[PDB]
Amino acid sequence: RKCSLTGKWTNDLGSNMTIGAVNSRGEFTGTYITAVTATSNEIKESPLHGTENTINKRTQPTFGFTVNWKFSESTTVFTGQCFIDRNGKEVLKTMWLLRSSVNDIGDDWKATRVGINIFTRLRT
Amino acid sequence: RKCSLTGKWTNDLGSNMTIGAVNSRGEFTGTYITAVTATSNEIKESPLHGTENTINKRTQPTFGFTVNWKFSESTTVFTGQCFIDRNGKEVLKTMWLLRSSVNDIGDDWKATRVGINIFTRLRT
Amino acid sequence: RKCSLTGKWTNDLGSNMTIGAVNSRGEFTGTYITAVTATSNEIKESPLHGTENTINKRTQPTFGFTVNWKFSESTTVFTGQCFIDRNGKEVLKTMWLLRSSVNDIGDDWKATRVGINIFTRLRT
């Protein structure tokens, strides 16, 4: 059996996400819920759109998703791999790119930040 | 007066992509065409899915998308901004993360590459 | 009350490093010890050279350094900040770029990997 994207996840920074069902083509949607980035009020929710690589029907697939922020002009992309570890726990190890909006093409060079995130299943 | 993602673009390496109509939620799909990476043959086509940010309806929006490679177990994600350049040309400036599949979670650390890509309109 | 780089540290993967005294221009040298990457054997040691930023004499300075791999044609660069964590422990948080050698300039696009590393004091 394989590492499944569908469901509820949580990270190290305290953000959560829900991913709906993965279609035949390898497609999925969900929502990204966060508490840190720049501002919000309290808790904010944004949609995510992604894909799971289905080649060789691997048990521990790679994937990618885009987060369309609703409270900002930015976009964030995540890519990683759905692993199985801890004693048999599912884990997502990801790396991301955060693109800020700049006003002029000449500041383009300073628009992209990078980092990681690790996700584990939310007690449920 | 409005950098649009819909269309045919080509890059700095020979790869091309075509993007469909963007819908009201800022969602789009498209196709990615290349021969790079490591696949000889002639040309391979893979699907892509992403979003364009609509907050504040900027004329030079940020966006993101994932390429679901059909001839590989990898995933590539792209993020950037659609700019109107000094000469009136539309230019996509992006950065990408290319995720390779590993067999052991232990090898995760070396699974991520990063680079840039510059796209220009081809549908002249 | 002052995160210092001088010392012995270990990371999240088993690698260790020792850094010498930092001089008045913020310059330092040291050694990097590991068995990862892809080199079996037991343990290999490579030299490192870098700087610590002294502008404003912050207590949690940023720094950078390069590892000159002695058993490979590659180069790795690290950058981060030396923090004093909530519990009083010193912590190095860094990101790295690992550059592999290519034969043709044409293959440049795929030569760069990126990741993270967390260091903790070992010289207890």
Added chain:
Amino acid sequence: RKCSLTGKWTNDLGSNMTIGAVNSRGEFTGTYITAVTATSNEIKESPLHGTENTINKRTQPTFGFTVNWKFSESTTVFTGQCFIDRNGKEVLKTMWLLRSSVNDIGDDWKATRVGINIFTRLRT
């Protein structure tokens, strides 16, 4: 004959650098001169410390260097490869990490930006 680091270089953004002689060990120093980043007055100069990988005495070596900014609390690291192309011109293709200084360990996630730079010899 090989691609040599020693000398004067210029980039795409309009910054310049001078690299002194490379010792036996593969070590070098130089200065980084820039006009864009955040502020300065007019033209600012900062020192750089790096290394050239000498394994297999390659003709087109990889290298890494750290830039110790003098007008800011940040640090930038560059890594890349010294190529030969254009009709036989020397070029440096680089990728970099820019670390900003943050006040608290909890904002660490947003401290690192990434990008590229291409350098060519300054008419001399």
